[PDB]
Amino acid sequence: AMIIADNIKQFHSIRNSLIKQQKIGFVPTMGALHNGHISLIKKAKSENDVVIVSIFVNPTQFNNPNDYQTYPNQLQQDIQILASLDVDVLFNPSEKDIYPDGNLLRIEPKLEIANILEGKSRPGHFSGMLTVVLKLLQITKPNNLYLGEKDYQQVMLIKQLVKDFFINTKIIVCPTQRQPSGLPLSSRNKNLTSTDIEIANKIYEILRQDDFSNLEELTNKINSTGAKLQYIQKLNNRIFLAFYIGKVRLIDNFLKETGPSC
Template sequence: MTALRTPTVVTDREALARVRDRADRPVAVVMTMGALHDGHAALLRQARARAATVIATVFVNPLQFGPNEDFDRYPRTLEGDLEICAREEVDVVFAPTPAVMYPDGQPNTRVNPGPLGEILEGASRPGFFHGVLTVVLKLINLTRPDVVFFGEKDYQQVALVRQMVRDLDLDIEVVGVPTVREPDGLALSSRNRYLSDSERTTALALAAALRAGAAAPGGAAAVEEAARSVLEQADGLELDYGVVTAPDLGPAPASGPARLLLAAKVGTTRLIDNGPVTL
């Protein structure tokens, strides 16, 4: 059996700068909040296939949690995360504390995502994408990647990172990786571990709603109605939104490729999912 590669683990800026200066290019970065699962492994695998050096970041970012959200109970599983990183042949893991990322406390300067950051997740979680883009930009500056990989389960996040890269002239490539699912269709998420067995069964309604929407004939309204009808029949599920947009999250086209995005609360756990549809 081939021995697993042991990643170099760094926790401060100076150590990261030293290993990054020695890194062979191209450098790929996968940014995570830890609690890694097979969805993250898929990102790391694609990064490994593309780059000479793979850096994974593990940081639970306080800026993107609202006052009533789950920052304190968000799972922190660094030992298990490192095992997955070793299995996927990651070279460097950057695992800073909030004090390392924000040495002067929460920053006064933050990235404003613009109108695209105020819809969907941004409407439900005010300020969320300001926190996401701020930490992504900081991590880009610290790790200096040639290419970054993000999962399409967080579809709006991928769109906003691409927008930021374009708008701020960042010389990096952004790659979106398709959502990884359980055999029964449930999208992999670190928050799935919060679900009880019965809640997990209820959560399958999101994947069923995506299938119903994709199969619905007609325009955006028909797709939304088909998806919502599935979700509204699921006991214990509270629908936040079920919306069809253009692939770039603009207004839904009259016909052609589009995206169906869903968010719902199952018990106390908020879940999101999305998938392509053709109108």
């Protein structure tokens, strides 16, 4: 029953066949679906008549080229997951569909929350992300856009994007889905080896015990587990941090009063 649109020409046909009384929900992903994505999709199934899910590994938001090649790819598994959830339309475009002449016109963020944290650590990422989200919103034209809380700056920037370019879409932010240890579900965690999981469980054991009053002391407790902390910083009752376990980069953010709570 689920419609799969491999290119933008077929999607335009599907999208143009919907009338203005149908509530349309849109969940953009880069595939490799986990319960974090599924929590977003179930939220959209309950508030909308039509749920569109996009799968597109956007090259322009990958500052690290090795990250782009080793990004998890499980398309057939994702289609099975999406069909199980009764998703109406899957939008799975190619690079030349979204960038017919390459990346010539780009959204550039010139504000503070784009210059710190993920933006400071990932140059060019937010520009690539914002450009493709605008393209996808211009394509899908949804009533409701669903975003995960795990990418907090991404949520804030897209909220600014929808406002500044007058897109008539409501943004629904969903809580981060976590393993019992507190580790946020993430597609890149597929690359984590056996001991790597044990290392990540050590860190969140620490994070759930710490009051985050001494961030330098906490940095040492984290690096002792074998991971390499990239940054950790408090920003408005909310702790942001990113670290490396092996060749896998992990990010997380959470309230200070709760920690990585379940």
